[PDB]
Design a protein around this ligand. Structure first.
Ligand SMILES: [K+]
Ligand SMILES: [Mg+2]
Ligand SMILES: [Mg+2]
Length: 297
């Protein structure tokens, strides 16, 4: 095994037994026709590894909207392209069921994650993210029962690899999850998402409570801009979050590898799929490249 195994002990996600924070980058919605398919390539993964010094990539598979996995198996193929490349490159890779409604498609999630666990669960690289961003729904009554069903299905095949579970309110309410944690399975962490224009110390305080209640967090998506993925790059608030992640050994992936005309995109419209120069990178992209490159200092 050429990368260390990911596990959880108390409020820390460990890599080969070590508490630390790793950094990387999320792909956009995989959905056919949404414009960002062209970045789901081995070339792009290699460039993130070499030039961003990324440790993690996140493959964000659309599920239930037009063009998503429920309608079009090509979404899975794009995920596989990135997973295979991450394994070959000795990067961690998150397989993200990129839904806001996963409780409505429990059987389909189970079947997908069983397939992924069969294909990939003996690789230490692979991490499962079973529910991107629940909405304003109950942790105990809606998310938790979905999550226990999917986790049990994964764990029957793949006993060890990390599973990360979304939390209420766009993966903000990690404190609610921490009040009724998933104790019946090992190596479970919980999702925290922030955007620097929208979520400030109040959300850090909720995350701090969650960790001090005993659960481990993984910041599988965050942006430099506003929560809608557009707006001004907010350096000072981004940097306050980065300091909080480094202090608390929380790993993270930035939104997003995309050339869509919105502030969160790493690259300008029509940029090449890899090899990005500073003119190819957006204001966010240039700043994120510096954060991820220097993360290991
Ligand atoms: K657990
Ligand atoms: Mg395994
Ligand atoms: Mg604001």
């Amino acid at each position: 095994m050429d990368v260390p195994a990911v596990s959880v002990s108390g409020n820390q996600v460990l890599f080969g037994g070590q508490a630390k924070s790793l950094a990387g980058n999320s792909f956009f919605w995989s959905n056919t026709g949404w414009g960002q398919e062209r970045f789901y390539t081995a070339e792009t993964v290699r460039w993130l590894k070499s030039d961003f010094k990324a440790s993690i990539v996140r493959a964000s598979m659309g599920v239930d909207d037009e063009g998503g996995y429920l309608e079009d198996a090509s979404n899975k193929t794009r995920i596989e392209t990135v997973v295979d490349a991450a394994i070959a490159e000795d990067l961690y890779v998150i397989i993200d069921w990129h839904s806001h409604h996963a409780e409505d498609y429990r059987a389909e999630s189970i079947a997908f994650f069983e397939e992924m666990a069969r294909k990939y669960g003996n690789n230490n690289h692979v991490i499962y993210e079973i529910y991107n961003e629940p909405l304003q729904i109950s942790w105990s009554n809606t998310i938790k029962p979905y999550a226990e069903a999917v986790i049990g299905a994964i764990r029957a095949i793949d006993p060890d690899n990390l599973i990360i579970v979304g939390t209420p309110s766009w993966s903000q309410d990690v404190d609610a999850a921490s009040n009724d944690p998933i104790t019946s399975y090992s190596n479970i962490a919980y999702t925290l998402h922030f955007y620097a224009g929208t979520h400030q110390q109040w959300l850090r305080d909720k995350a701090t409570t969650a960790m001090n209640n005993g659960i481990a967090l993984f910041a599988t998506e965050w942006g430099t801009v506003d929560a809608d993925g557009d707006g001004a790059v907010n350096r000072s608030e981004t940097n306050a979050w980065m300091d909080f992640f480094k202090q608390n050994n929380i790993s993270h992936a930035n939104w997003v590898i995309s050339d869509k005309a919105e502030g969160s995109s790493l690259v300008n419209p029509n940029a090449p799929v890899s090899g990005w120069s500073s003119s190819d990178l957006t204001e966010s992209g240039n700043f994120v490249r510096d954060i991820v490159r220097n993360w290991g200092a």
